[PDB]
From a paper:
Tripartite motif ([name]) proteins constitute one of the largest subfamilies of the RING-type E3 ubiquitin ligases that play a role in diverse processes from homeostasis and immune response to viral restriction. The [name] domain, or so-called [name] repeats named after ncl-1, HT2A and lin-41, forms another protein module found in four TRIMs, including [name], TRIM3, TRIM32 and TRIM71, that constitute the subclass VII. Here, high-resolution crystal structures of the [name] domains of three of the four human [name]–[name] proteins, namely [name], TRIM3 and TRIM71, are presented. Comparative structural analyses revealed that, despite sharing an evolutionarily conserved six-bladed β-propeller architecture, the low sequence identities resulted in distinct properties of these interaction domains at their putative binding sites for macromolecules.
The [name] domains of [name] and TRIM3 were highly expressed as a fusion protein with an N-terminal His6-GST tag in E. coli. For [name], the structure was refined to a high resolution of 1.45 Å, and the crystals belonged to the monoclinic P21 space group with four molecules in the asymmetric unit. Nonetheless, an exception was noted when comparing [name] and TRIM3 that were most similar with ∼82% sequence identity. In contrast, the rather shallow flat surface of the [name]/3 NHLs resembles that of their homologue DmBrat, which has been shown to recognize a linear RNA. However, comparative analyses suggest that similar binding of an RNA observed previously in DmBrat would be unlikely in [name]/3 due to the lack of a central channel as well as low sequence conservation within the pockets. [name] [name] has been shown to interact with the motor-protein myosin V, and the function of this E3 ligase has been linked to neuronal activity including neurons and axon growth. In line with this, genetic studies have unveiled a number of mutations in the [name] motifs of TRIMs with a link to diverse pathological outcomes, in particular, diverse neurological disorders. This includes a link of the mutations in [name] [name] to Charcot-Marie-Tooth disease (CMT), congenital bilateral vocal-cord paralysis (BVCP) and axonal neuropathy. A frameshift within blade 2 (K567Rfs7X) undoubtedly leads to a loss of the [name] domain, whereas the other nonsense mutation (R741X) results in the loss of four amino acids at the C terminus on the bottom surface. The other mutations include a substitution, D640A, and a deletion, N594del, both of which are located in the proximity of the central groove on the top surface, thus they could affect directly the integrity of the intermolecular interface.
Residue numbers in the entry: 467 to 744
Write the structure that this text describes.
């Protein structure tokens, strides 16, 4: 299979600029940037939407303003960069140039992964290890928390990533329950979708997620390494065609300001950018 929906790929294994060890979170900004968090290189790298390297920041360590196992990444409308740290157990807010401003969740989080910003400016934090989701004020006060460890609708099993749709509904990938779950802005369960398998519309261990302007939910899965698109009611629509250069254990996923889908192809030490809107 010679061609698919891939536009370009960036990255090889390593610790230098444009190289990766463990791609995790992916974010994309309204200023036309792609941001990649690397949990094992302890850095965030910023690229243009066309894949050109722009900048890198991240100081290894366990103190405030350092990164130890950075996972989720989001960009605030302000341009600040929000980074979850699984090992430091807090979420940092950096400037667009990587200056540490504040951290939230310290003493509250067990092991965060996904981070997002809701339509009201709340910071949504997926606590992968605690199997719950927090909604924080920017000052670090908890608005609400939802979920606990388990297999049921209102539980999570290693939740990974988050997205927020135009109705301020929160979308969570529930990795070890093989489903995507949608909540209202109060954190109350609305619906789940997905099934564990290899056939059409099925997946295994959903990871990266995004939601488009029409409410369609774009989901990467770690176990089959595909990207599947669902409508906002959770019904399968289509694949993003990755067959010419397959994924291997994808992590974070984002929609870019130029209408593409970017995915962390972590097992192949690269990010891949796909046609989506055109």
């Amino acid at each position: 299979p010679i061609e698919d929906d891939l536009i370009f790929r960036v990255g090889t294994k390593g610790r230098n600029k444009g190289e990766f060890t463990n791609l995790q979170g992916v974010a994309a900004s309204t200023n036309g940037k792609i941001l990649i968090a690397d949990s094992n290189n302890q850095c965030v790298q910023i690229f243009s939407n066309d894949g050109q390297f722009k900048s890198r920041f991240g100081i290894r360590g366990r103190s405030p303003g350092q990164l130890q196992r950075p996972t989720g990444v989001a960009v605030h409308p302000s341009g600040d960069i929000i980074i979850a740290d699984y090992d430091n157990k807090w979420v940092s807010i950096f400037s667009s140039d990587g200056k540490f401003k504040t951290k939230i969740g310290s003493g509250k989080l067990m092991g965060p992964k996904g981070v997002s910003v809701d339509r009201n400016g709340h910071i949504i934090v997926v606590d992968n290890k605690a199997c719950c989701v927090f909604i924080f004020q920017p000052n670090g006060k908890i608005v609400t928390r939802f979920g606990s460890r388990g297999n049921g609708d209102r539980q999570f099993a290693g939740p990974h990533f988050a997205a927020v749709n135009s109705n301020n509904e929160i979308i969570i990938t529930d990795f070890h329950n093989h489903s995507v779950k949608v909540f209202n802005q109060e954190g109350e369960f609305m619906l789940k979708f997905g099934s564990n398998g290899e056939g059409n519309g099925q997946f295994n261990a959903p990871t990266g997620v995004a939601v488009d302007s029409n409410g369609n939910i774009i989901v990467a899965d770690w176990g089959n390494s595909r990207i599947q698109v669902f409508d906002g009611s959770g019904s399968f629509l289509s694949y993003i065609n990755t067959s010419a250069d397959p994924l291997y254990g994808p992590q974070g996923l984002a929609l870019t300001s130029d209408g593409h889908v970017v995915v962390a192809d972590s097992g192949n030490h690269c990010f891949k950018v796909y046609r989506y809107l055109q």
